[PDB]
Amino acid sequence: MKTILSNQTVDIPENVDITLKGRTVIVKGPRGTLRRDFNHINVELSLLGKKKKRLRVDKWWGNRKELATVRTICSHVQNMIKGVTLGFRYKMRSVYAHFPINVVIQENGSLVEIRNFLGEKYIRRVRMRPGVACSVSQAQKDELILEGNDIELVSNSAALIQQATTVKNKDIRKFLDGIYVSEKGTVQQA
Amino acid sequence: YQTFQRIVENVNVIISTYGEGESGPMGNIMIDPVLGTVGFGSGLHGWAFTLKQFAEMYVAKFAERAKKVEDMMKKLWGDRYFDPANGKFSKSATSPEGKKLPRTFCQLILDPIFKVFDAIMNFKKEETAKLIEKLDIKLDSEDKDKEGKPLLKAVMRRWLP
Amino acid sequence: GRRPARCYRYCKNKPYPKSRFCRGVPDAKIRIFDLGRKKAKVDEFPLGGHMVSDEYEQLSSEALEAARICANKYMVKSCGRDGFHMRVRLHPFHVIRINKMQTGMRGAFGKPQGTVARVHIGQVIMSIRTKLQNEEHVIEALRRAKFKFPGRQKIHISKKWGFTKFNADEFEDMVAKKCLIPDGCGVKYVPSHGPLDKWRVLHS
């Protein structure tokens, strides 16, 4: 079955403005700007409000699989709005039984050095995605903070660290050491 | 300090449970660091200390001497805190201003040892010289030329046999 | 020691019954065809479920026995020991032969190896009768028994009452009108012809 019309609307806050260039969305807010094109999805995007700033995604004559993309686009745009207004902050706790995992943060927070993971002498060097800043928290002991605007990049960097600290040739239900994402929140808490 | 406290608590609960004898033919059996029946250190590097020894050296900084050392032996362990800025002990964790305070154990027992360890492991020659001259210990031959972990082991042997 | 059943899946030969011409036939694996409460009255188990083959093929007596055992075990587990009656309605009357390997295909006629039941499209293989509230258990037991058979089978909830040949919606008022008289697990049809003495035995 081909549904005649499937549309979804997202609301844009006052402090953030959205510009459309075809299927390329530019979301500019107080924390910076974000670009993302959706040329891989055949939808129409329209800006409706001069007062309340609604963005509408319409898909005409779509089947099941391509009606599944309307809310995907809407959620991506909402994540863009969230990133440019509040930002994204992923906390990572480093857990270990015996050997403390020593994480040092190199230039501007874009490079992470894991030293003593499970007592190994190999030094893990993980480079964050551009626009992502890593730091060692002051409130908690074994905690890293990854902050950025693009949720894609922030969570990809968190996954890079988590998969860098991976146990080999051992029962992973017993050897639980590693750095794991503990919380996925925002910055500015608003 | 927390690990030490957990260990002494476990030993004391073993003594309480299986040693059903209260203060009787043997009296009080429970180990207490304040009582001097608990020691700390490492056998491999041949250095160990006790609250007796640290109270002794701090009193020497400050019979009757034995009694005073015994009193500060009670003072050095527990949740009783010490103000680093004032130089006086205290009971409440909050300072008069409100900032958190280190306990007496961590501030004047673990802290000098930690400073010695940091200086020798990081090869800060000026700071190691300052620490050894403040702790007024001498070194014999063949170890003043050794640096690093051998230096640390020799210094700890000389300071806290 | 037994050949794969794919070698005797199809009704290729004419029916070859155990007879005075076919002697020395080993006994079929299945010797029991009714299980559960066989003594239950007709009114106790009004729900009937059938396994019906969609294939014109041969089912070995070993497979009939295996399916019987599996369905019986599931029915005992779900409905209790006395909560159902099962009837296997295929008897292995066809004898399959084997030419065990003078030399070659000389004198190739085989010796009786085993027995199979010859089943047609739309024929009932197994039946379970039980209370109305055990329909799901009957369907699942027959569905499990389907895995012991080569071809394709359908599970069908019969429209008849129990194991009889009378429809389940007219059974009760036929019993009321005395057109049906219970006798064990079945019913006897009483036509309105014959001596009047038989009619006088009823209505009295």
Binding site: - | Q2, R6, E9, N12, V13, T17, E22, M30, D79 | -
Partner: protein
């Protein structure tokens, strides 16, 4: 059985509303069946309590509006986990006895703590084998008289946080009164009135 259950409920609620002209609408906190039955024992001799689906109640009273008017005031008020207590006694007596019969419920893990509770420094009197639960919380303790003695006060639970699994069982074995809560009267209804 659902249809007859709902019809029996409608009959019950309309007859109870007609038979009792004075009732208090009360919001139920995280109150257990034990606390509910305790209230039932303490109140059932003189008053009754009925609570169910808000849509059930609203449908019943909206259908009963034309027969017995002046009940429309309750419709935009029965929201959330609320119910009615039907009493023929005075407002002050019902209110103060209902606030009097509070129950000290235990501190369940994974629960918001509204009240702040701090354990004092005292000989808890339990055996010298439950030291594991104290060490899990990090409490320094010693043995005196063959029992665990708290050397100093420690703040267990703050306000508006999560009660940890170990803290819950430590409180349970220490046998004190943690944060407690009952059913709080949202408001009253005295023959067509709304008060506090």
């Amino acid at each position: 059985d659902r249809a007859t259950w709902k019809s029996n409920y409608f009959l019950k609620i309309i007859q109870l509303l007609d038979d009792y002209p004075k009732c208090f609408i009360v919001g139920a906190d995280n109150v257990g069946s034990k606390q509910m039955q305790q209230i039932r024992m303490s109140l059932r001799g003189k008053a009754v309590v009925l609570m169910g689906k808000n849509t059930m109640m609203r449908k019943a009273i909206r259908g009963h509006l034309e027969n017995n008017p002046a009940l429309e005031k309750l419709l935009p008020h029965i929201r959330g986990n609320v119910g009615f207590v039907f009493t023929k006694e005075d407002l002050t007596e019902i209110r103060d006895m209902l606030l009097a019969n509070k129950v000290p419920a235990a501190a369940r893990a994974g629960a918001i703590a509204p009240c702040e509770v701090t354990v004092p420094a005292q000989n808890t009197g339990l055996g010298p084998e439950k030291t594991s639960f104290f060490q899990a919380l990090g409490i320094t303790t010693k043995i005196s008289r063959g029992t665990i003695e708290i050397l100093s006060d420690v703040q267990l639970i703050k306000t508006g946080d999560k009660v940890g699994a170990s803290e819950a069982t430590l409180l349970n074995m220490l046998n004190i009164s943690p944060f407690s809560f009952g059913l709080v009267i949202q408001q009253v209804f005295d023959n067509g009135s709304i008060y506090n």
